[PDB]
Design a protein around this ligand. Sequence first.
Ligand SMILES: Nc1ncnc2c1ncn2[C@@H]1O[C@H](COP(=O)(O)OP(=O)(O)O)[C@@H](O)[C@H]1O
Ligand SMILES: Nc1ncnc2c1ncn2[C@@H]1O[C@H](COP(=O)(O)OP(=O)(O)O)[C@@H](O)[C@H]1O
Ligand SMILES: [Ca+2]
Lengths: 282, 357, 135, 402, 166, 168, 204
Amino acid sequence: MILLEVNNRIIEETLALKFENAAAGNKPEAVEVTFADFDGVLYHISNPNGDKTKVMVSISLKFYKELQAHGADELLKRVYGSYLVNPESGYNVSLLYDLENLPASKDSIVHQAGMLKRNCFASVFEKYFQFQEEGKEGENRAVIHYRDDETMYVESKKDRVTVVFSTVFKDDDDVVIGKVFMQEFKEGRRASHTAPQVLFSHREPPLELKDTDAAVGDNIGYITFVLFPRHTNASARDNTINLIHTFRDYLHYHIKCSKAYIHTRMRAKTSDFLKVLNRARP
Amino acid sequence: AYHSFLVEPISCHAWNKDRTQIAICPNNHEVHIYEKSGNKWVQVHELKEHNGQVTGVDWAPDSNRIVTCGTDRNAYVWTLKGRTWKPTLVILRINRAARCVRWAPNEKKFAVGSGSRVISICYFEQENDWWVCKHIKKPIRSTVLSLDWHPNSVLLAAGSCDFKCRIFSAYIKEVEERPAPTPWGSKMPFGELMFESSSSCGWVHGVCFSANGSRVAWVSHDSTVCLADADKKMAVATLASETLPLLAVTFITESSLVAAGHDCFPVLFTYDSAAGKLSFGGRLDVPRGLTARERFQNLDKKAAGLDSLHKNSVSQISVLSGGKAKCSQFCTTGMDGGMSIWDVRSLESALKDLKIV
Amino acid sequence: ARFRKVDVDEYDENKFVDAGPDEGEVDSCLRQGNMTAALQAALKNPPINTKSQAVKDRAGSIVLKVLISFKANDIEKAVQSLDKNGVDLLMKYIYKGFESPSDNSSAVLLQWHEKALAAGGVGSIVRVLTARKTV
Amino acid sequence: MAGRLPACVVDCGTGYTKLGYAGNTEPQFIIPSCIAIKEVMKGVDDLDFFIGDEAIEKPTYATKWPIRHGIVEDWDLMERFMEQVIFKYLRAEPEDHYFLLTEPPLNTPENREYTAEIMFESFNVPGLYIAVQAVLALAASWTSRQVGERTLTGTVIDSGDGVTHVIPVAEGYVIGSCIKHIPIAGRDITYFIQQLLRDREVGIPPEQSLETAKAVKERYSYVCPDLVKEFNKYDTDGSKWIKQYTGINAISKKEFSIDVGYERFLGPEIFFHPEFANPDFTQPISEVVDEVIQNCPIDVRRPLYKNIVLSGGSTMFRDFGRRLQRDLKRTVDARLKLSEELKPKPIDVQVITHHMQRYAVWFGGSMLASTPEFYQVCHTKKDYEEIGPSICRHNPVFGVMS
Amino acid sequence: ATLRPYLSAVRATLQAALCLENFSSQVVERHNKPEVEVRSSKELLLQPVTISRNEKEKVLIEGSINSVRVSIAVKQADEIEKILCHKFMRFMMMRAENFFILRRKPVEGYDISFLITNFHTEQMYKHKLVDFVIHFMEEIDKEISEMKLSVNARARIVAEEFLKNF
Amino acid sequence: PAYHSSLMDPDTKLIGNMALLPIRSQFKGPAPRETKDTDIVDEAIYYFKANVFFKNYEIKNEADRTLIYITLYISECLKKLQKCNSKSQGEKEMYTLGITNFPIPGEPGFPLNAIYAKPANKQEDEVMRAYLQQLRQETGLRLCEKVFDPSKWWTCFVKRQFMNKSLS
Amino acid sequence: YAQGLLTGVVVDSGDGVTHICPVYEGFSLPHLTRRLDIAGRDITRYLIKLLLLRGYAFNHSADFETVRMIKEKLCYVGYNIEQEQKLALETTVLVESYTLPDGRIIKVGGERFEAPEALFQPHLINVEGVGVAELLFNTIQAADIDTRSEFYKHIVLSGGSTMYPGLPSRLERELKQLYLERVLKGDVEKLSKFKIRIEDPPRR
Ligand SMILES: Nc1ncnc2c1ncn2[C@@H]1O[C@H](COP(=O)(O)OP(=O)(O)O)[C@@H](O)[C@H]1O
Ligand SMILES: Nc1ncnc2c1ncn2[C@@H]1O[C@H](COP(=O)(O)OP(=O)(O)O)[C@@H](O)[C@H]1O
Ligand SMILES: [Ca+2]
């Protein structure tokens, strides 16, 4: 697995099992599940008021208000329609499935439910893609604190939309490994001349943000993605979003798997060394 | 002629009067005695008493008593009662590991060098019925690694980690007679320091007295072999080696020494009495014979990468026959667990260039 | 616990207890380009007895200055012009040199080690480790 | 750190791996402990692998089982396995979640360091705790209505597929020197039922003989009190004891139907009568438990008899515990008979059974990792960095006293 | 051009230093300790020597009557090599009990250290240990380079896989 | 453990070390006359399906030896009774196989010669041979009004050997 | 008696208790005699705790004998704890293998000298008072200022818990330290004249 998956398996598999049983005609079993997703996301699937014929799926994001100021509510409503109900206390968005009133094809809803998180992030990107497509420049950028100490900046310009990530490398040595990966992103057009341009700035943020309360420090790194109309138009929009909103975690995921790969190399070499050593015995 | 008794070290060894039995310590708290049966070796005895590793073993030829010392601070005299060896404790009065032990030629006393920076001279009393000892302390500053008695059973040579080779009087007027004068000195009261090497280099791993005792030799960790000549006002000949440190040395004539060590093979040294110079006589273990059987075996076949018999450091060497005046056969034991028997005349034949004495 | 802080061993009564070449003479040879000569002079009267590190680092530098001033292809011959005591002292100096790597001085010093080793054998190195009084 | 995010709980067994978040009653995923790879790695070949079910039938990949006898045998494979457990299934940002992993008793201290080297140095987790399976199984029994006092002193009867273990535990710490293994377990019950079906039923595709056996076992088997009286039931009223099992032929894609009878109670019986199937082992499980408890310290060989707990698929069998308690009590009583004859206070023998037995270990782990105490005993990233992986050698037991 | 000359000097020094023997403690009744570690008897310690290839690469060899300590300064050209080397040396030190001649920690100023005692020279051919140390120095440089190429190769594939999907 | 017989009595008679247990039968033989509703042949048949799986059997009474013999025989009857297409046909197989002379204690072929005492003289040899035959008769006669349905649940054991021994 | 002594101090440590019995040219002196509530059982118990922090959990009752055997075979007294700790943290020379009764092999290192340190630092195992050395010291200093030197140069160990390699050496160093601080008030100058020879008989 190179690219991170977009959908949440716990959600889909939980709803599928319940839908499969409601269709078979079995008495509904109670469901109570708490789980998470990347970036501080907390979920809750349960039976509101103990009614086993109802299954609620709720998501909690510490930064939901910021996404709300950028069309999150409207977008979630277009997608989920009547499945979207008043948010369960402690969460920002709640989907309610009536096991007694399910659609003929329970497939697209199970799929859309699995993308609750992704759909919560969707609007901020759509809003700024639209700006670029309407030549509306000068619009204040979106500032999303997707993690306690990380920030994403979205901004629309005349011919391009930029997404900036201010990420942290808790592990000091993870910065060094990260730079190797960032260098490759930087020269990426050498393999896809049409793909987004990618910049990287070690301790300091891009100059446009040097006047804001942006973070500075040895374990901080800034990555900028420059998206073009071919990526922000109505035809590529969704794929572009599924990719871009996973980037941050994609970078860190690969930094870690890389360290796991080096471990296998170290086991093989240390192992070989032990044989030579033992081979020195009479 | 090499034989492998084991693969771990032979810490120390000792042969009886007839060279019919060899006592070895296999990196243990024990001493195994091997006897030869036909052309094979057979273990006949197993002396278990020490509670630590055995570091020295010496066999008094006529009385047939074996003495041992170990890291357990103890020493034991073994007597053969019928078919089994029985140990008798000898309190050395030391608080550190014993390192070496040698019976005096007269078998009336034995000496133990230890980590207590002292040498314990032990003798028996036929009144209280046990062993006692006097300590030779000054001016020893470190662990005593080796000993060798002078033929008069009084003068005693010692090598220490304080980089010195010394000769002391171990005279015990309760078992022997006032000793006769020697070029080393006329005054030999107990503990008297007769001679002390001059140098602050290398632990002295081994010391040996020539057959008549007028010469003393020792090998140090700084890869030098030395010889002090009492007939030449105790002048000292020194020879610096181009190879690794020697750990054992012995005279094979009044003017020839054979030594071995970390290089893993015996070498010959000769002394020029007139020039007072030590010279490298060459390697003795060199990798087609004179006899039919030999020519056959020595013929090469078709087809531890070391070109020496021993595969690890040789730590001890002893004269098997011919004494130290005209040695004919000598023995080597080492950290590889091997024991090799070398024949002086064979070496002379196979090495036309060899020049002894 | 305060009483265990002091190392009483420091005062035990059973513990063991153990002026350089001519700067001008060397420079004179170097300037005239007589390398071998400069070396033999530099390997003279080493500070084996002075307890001063300054005097020792001085003899070391004079020696190092000569070794570095040598041409790779001329090291052998020079080394072969020394007697055994010379080679031992040389080796002791080559080792002293490794402790002060500079503008590739160790590249040539390794050439010196190679030749010094060929002349004095591993025995000469052993005597560097065994020295109580050294350069 | 005890925060808004629940800890991750991963229980890696020999056959299946249970994973999910602390607090939940069932695992969120239960997958085969296997990883399928391709077979000098370059680029990202190390990432081309699958795990669990996705890894069992993969046409162009070779299926490997990193775990044998409950212990990691291939660390490279275990490490990659964890990558998906975290980033693909749990979907947990590993730096925000404390982790609770499990280990069989007897797992070496070195292995704990190897495990920590992975969790802290590859995945940079903030906290790690390695709990021993048996202890968690004890903690799991605290859910039963039979117990009113929490305790980590008991006898754990763990039976998976390979071997069954009788593990005595005293105050949270397994008494390793007194463990005993039994050459009878899941695979022995399956192979046996296989023969019974062969010597009678026809239609079972010889290629799916094992499948059918393992299926019938966990769908119809159980433990009866008396073999003859039972054989007397199936024969007198066979119309209300003989069940049917229809299955799918592989090649023909056709449903064949066989009868299920005597094997129903004969399968599980081998626990109490090993001689039925194993020519080398003949100790009834009731005897082995007794033996183990008798070998333990005198002062603890009573709290043990009173708290016998079950864990593993092989203990799901209806009446397994009841039969175990009965037999063990007949033994212990018979013995104290010859003492009065040849008046020791009677021995209370109790075998606990509960609803969370299939995944007792993960359940216990999930319940313990969702408490404040868990966060106190876990070793932190900071402690790992300042003291070293040796701190993970010991994991303080908790959950009882307070 | 400077590799072989460097390793040759180091190999010869190792032969000189690896001439050990069993030595019971002189300071502690019935103890046996590696003198180069405890250093409680100055006369048992040999002169520390160094072999350097340049300002960065070097080997410190400390001998004593019954043990030798060997510390190596590994070549680290840039940051990725520095961190790979540190992780690799840490990796081996953690497994020191299996790699019985390794110190659990390097001597201050070095990346990795060995502690070879008389028991080791008694149980293994000393010339094979010397071979191992030299072999070790060469092989770690090679492994570090391969690790470096790996991280770069996987990084390129990772950047493309992501970029090519837009 | 295994299922044992409870028919042993202080007055029960012996033939070798096998219990000469009463059997409600008509066939000729030294078997005593049984007045009760159940005899050793009943027990053997009742406990068969269970006992056949055991490999170890403690002998507690001379009656157990008698029970063990009938048990081992029941299996034999199953061998034949298997390939039979009628209860009446099997009724003749039990008669035919009942008269067939199987080995007895003391002879090679008889498993368990270490457990069963052999006949001490010619009389015992004849009496024991007869008691055994009479048992093989009544047993085989009761085994038919069972195995047949007016059964694979009796045929399945055909491959199982009690104590891993066989009369064949 | 054995050593031909009439007056001296006997330090005795067994499986259950430690006594410091001073004796003057004839018989004991119950007034000076002292006791240390730390001995064999205590060290063995402590080893068990130490091995637990190492990943080996031995039951206190079920395995007591096994851990006792490990103690007798591998434990010893440290001379300079700071130096011992460095050998344990930085190297592996202290690590020894030990085969348990069931065949499993465990590795024992620093705990080898750590368990017996309890004798010198009771607090380590939650016991009050000073260590055996300090106790011995006080016992002697609290006696006839005329028979002191006689005592010091005649200290004799007895009992199973006194066989730990290095014990005699540790005692001496500790006493020398106690003397340098509490009898010479830092005057290192006159330490060399202080005589202490702790007899370690080959028949303890
Ligand atoms: N309900 C059940 N009744 C009896 N046996 C079962 C049941 N469920 C599972 N089993 C058996 O439990 C055993 C589980 O073995 P294993 O694959 O090792 O699982 P795990 O690794 O989780 O312990 C198998 O023999 C399986 O057939
Ligand atoms: N070699 C040894 N090193 C340390 N302790 C030992 C050794 N041998 C025995 N012990 C311990 O000494 C104690 C037994 O000594 P002993 O004097 O017989 O006890 P006691 O005097 O109370 O009967 C036990 O704790 C035993 O484990
Ligand atoms: Ca498990």
